UniProtKB/Swiss-Prot annotation, chain A:
InterPro entries on file: Exonuclease_RNaseT/DNA_pol3, RNase_T, RNaseH-like_sf, RNaseH_sf
Effect of a null allele: Required for optimal growth. Significantly slowed cell growth, increased expression of sodB reporter construct.
Annotated function: Trims short 3' overhangs of a variety of RNA species, leaving a one or two nucleotide 3' overhang. Responsible for the end-turnover of tRNA: specifically removes the terminal AMP residue from uncharged tRNA (tRNA-C-C-A). Also appears to be involved in tRNA biosynthesis, especially in strains lacking other exoribonucleases.
Effect of D142A: Nearly abolishes enzyme activity
Protein name: Ribonuclease T
Lineage, opening ranks: Bacteria, Pseudomonadati, Pseudomonadota, Gammaproteobacteria, Enterobacterales
GO cellular component: cytosol
Keyword Nuclease set for record: yes
Enzyme class: hydrolase
Residue ranges constituting the Exonuclease domain according to the UniProt record: 12-186
Superkingdom in the source lineage: Bacteria
Outcome of swapping K100A: Strongly reduces affinity for RNA
Site (described: Important for substrate binding and specificity): F21, E65, F69, F116, F138
Swiss-Prot record, chain B:
Source organism of the structure: Escherichia coli (strain K12)
Name of this protein: Ribonuclease T
Binding site for Mg(2+) 2: D16, E18, H174, D179
EC number annotated for this UniProt entry: 3.1.13.-
Record-listed Mg(2+) 1 binding positions: D16
Length: 204, 202
């Protein structure tokens, strides 16, 4: 029922960490993705988590303030960084598999302040000349907006807390932790709508 | 009031734009409409004030025939009654600032369908017009395509409205005025429904 739930959209939770706000000039440094599934009773939950540290693309700009914010050291030899091509190709591939295996036709990014993460993902896919991009080129599910509606909060940490979730600022601004918190928040929001009887609308 | 408490000080304003292409930096803004919202005694959300403007293509703007065929707009119509981007935005920002003060919010947030698109065009037109004290938040938006996905399982405007039980007239679609009004009613219906089913207050 996953692909029935959003009319053929295959929701994938994404978070990105970067070296600035400029998607065309600034480095992509980190990306995590979480696919989702629906059980038999129609509840939504995380499926698979992918996480990559990303090497600054050749000639990339880097803003000191962004690095201070996310705490990432690009030259950290223990970072285990790969190219944007390698990271995005594997994320795209897992998503592409999920799509045709579930009956959806396109993936849609779920993210907190999604246009930020979406813009960076698209720019990096463009740089890497990745031909097959399973993600919708402009549509997103912004959890900041979704949390505004459901919890009256637009800030991730506060939203999770109000949602009755754990949240540790110590770990924030890290792709893996942020993506996982976002996935649980999204699932909680969707599941809660179902519990309240908001879903389904009618027979079907 | 209760409005400004509902979204932690954000003052939700519904926007829609018509353009001559998908590039917010280089393509002309052609139409813009704005609808502020209010909350009644029972705490239901509803439309307040409506503004609408036909916009003259800025000097040096590009024009995509496909976009113009779609929205039927002809930028060289003797009397589109068009005004400059500066004129439209100045008036909108003025009404919006008034709203913020009266209700006790501290910033405005754009409510639009596929909000990123409209938001980028609005910001570009503002820069272009060297306007300052833009009351709108520079990053945050309430995208009704995402909200309708959650609440209705539909991301397309016309489909989401119909699914919600509303009328959607294809004969009026793709006019800033008509689309903005449908977007506002859709957003109010979604917020109101969440409350109705006991999702709000917490
Ligand atoms: Co890259
Ligand atoms: Co203009």
């Amino acid at each position: 029922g996953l692909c029935d739930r959003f009319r053929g959209f295959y929701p994938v939770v994404i978070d990105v960490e970067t070296a600035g706000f400029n998607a065309k000039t600034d480095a992509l440094l980190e990306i995590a993705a979480i696919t989702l599934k629906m059980d038999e009773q129609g509840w939504l939950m995380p499926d698979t988590t992918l996480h990559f540290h990303v090497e600054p693309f050749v000639g990339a700009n880097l803003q000191p303030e962004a690095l201070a914010f996310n705490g990432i050291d690009p030259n950290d030899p223990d970072r285990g960084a790969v190219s944007g091509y390698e990271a995005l190709h594997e994320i795209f591939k897992v998503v592409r598999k999920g799509i045709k295996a579930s009956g959806c036709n396109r993936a849609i990014m779920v993210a907190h302040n999604a246009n930020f993460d979406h813009s960076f993902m698209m720019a990096a896919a463009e740089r890497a000349s990745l031909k097959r991009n399973p993600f919708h080129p402009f549509a997103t599910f912004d959890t900041a907006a979704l949390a505004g509606l459901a919890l009256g909060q637009t800030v991730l940490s506060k939203a999770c807390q109000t949602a009755g979730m754990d949240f540790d600022s110590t770990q924030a601004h890290s792709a893996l932790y942020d993506t996982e918190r976002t996935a649980v928040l999204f699932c909680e929001i969707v599941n809660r709508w179902k519990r309240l009887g908001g879903w389904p609308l009618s027979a079907a």
